[PDB]
């Protein structure tokens, strides 16, 4: 009766596999993972199970943006739509246009990724908030004062949206030769934190979080890491990853069942009989991942 092969019956099997500092894993947190899958460039899962993260040292929050600006283009080349999709073609323009300015001030010029956004500001007030797809450059730059009618920017041939933006709700009102679009632009902005052994890591992975919201925590305040608005929080780069035989059955509400007990293929779990099991062994009840795993028996 070895040691080892006996906390295998009793309690399960497990195994570590390490990784190689500033490796990122090719698996999620919690993911199910199969034996000979990839967890990582290098590693190699040998079973089947549950793919657990130790200690990562990169906490990625992909922050959400939202704008709404007004794009100005010839009624005859736009591709008139309710709702647009990252890359999606928003207009084709025969010939060069000037998207002028309809307004005057400064320009604050942000780059959106093959996209730019601008605001128009006179004193501190934003004036205007203008938006131009991939395609159309900018022809002005960042502190410029634009007059009205001077043109900002400038299409040749098809203009899309950035292959990460997404807009939706578009009023176009007609006017003549141009039409008049404003739009409610979406797009996440990511940012990364690393992690230092002495931090603790409050928020798991897929954790939708708030302005304010302790995401990482630590004994010393400017170690702190709080999330700077609404956004969804990653884990990456884990110094290692344990894999557990065992399957995971997430619910929506009430769990049906409590850590420590046995369970059978069929036996409830939660959702009321909505959530039944598929195989016999041990109960967690993880209200952190708002899941319960069943590891293996055997």
Do not use: C
């Not at 006017?175 to 979406?186: C, I, K, N, Q, R």
């Not at 990456?236 to 995971?248: T, Y």
């Amino acid at each position: 009766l070895t040691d080892e092969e006996y906390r295998e019956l009793r309690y399960g099997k497990q195994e570590t596999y390490p990784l190689p500092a500033g490796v990122d894993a090719l698996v999620k947190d919690g993911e199910e993972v199969v034996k000979g899958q990839e967890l990582a460039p290098g590693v190699v899962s040998r079973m089947d199970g549950v793919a657990l993260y130790r200690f990562p040292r990169r906490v990625r929050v992909d922050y959400l943006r939202k704008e709404r600006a007004a794009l100005r283009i010839p009624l005859s080349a736009w591709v008139e739509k309710e709702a647009y999709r990252p890359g999606e073609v928003l207009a084709e323009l025969s010939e060069p246009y000037l998207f002028r300015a309809e307004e005057s001030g400064v320009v604050e010029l942000k780059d959106l990724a093959e996209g730019h956004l601008i605001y128009l500001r006179q004193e501190e007030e934003v004036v205007a908030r203008y938006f131009l797809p991939a395609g159309m450059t900018p022809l002005v730059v960042e502190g410029e004062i634009v007059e009205v009618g001077q043109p900002l920017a400038e299409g040749k041939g098809l203009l899309r949206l950035p292959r990460h933006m997404t807009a939706k709700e578009v009023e176009a009102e007609e006017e003549g030769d141009s039409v008049h679009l404003t739009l409610f632009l979406e797009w996440t902005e990511p940012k990364d934190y690393k992690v230092a052994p002495h931090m603790n890591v409050i928020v798991p992975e897929g954790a939708k979080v708030q302005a304010g919201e302790k995401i990482v925590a630590a004994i010393d305040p400017e170690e702190e890491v709080i999330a700077e608005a609404e956004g969804v929080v990653h884990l990456h780069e884990p110094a290692s990853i344990l894999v557990v035989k065992a399957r995971v059955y997430p619910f929506e509400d009430d769990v049906e069942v409590t850590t420590g007990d046995r369970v059978a293929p069929g036996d409830v779990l939660a959702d009321g009989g909505k959530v039944k099991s598929e195989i016999y062994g041990r109960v967690e009840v993880d209200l952190v991942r708002n899941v319960v795993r069943v590891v293996e028996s055997y």
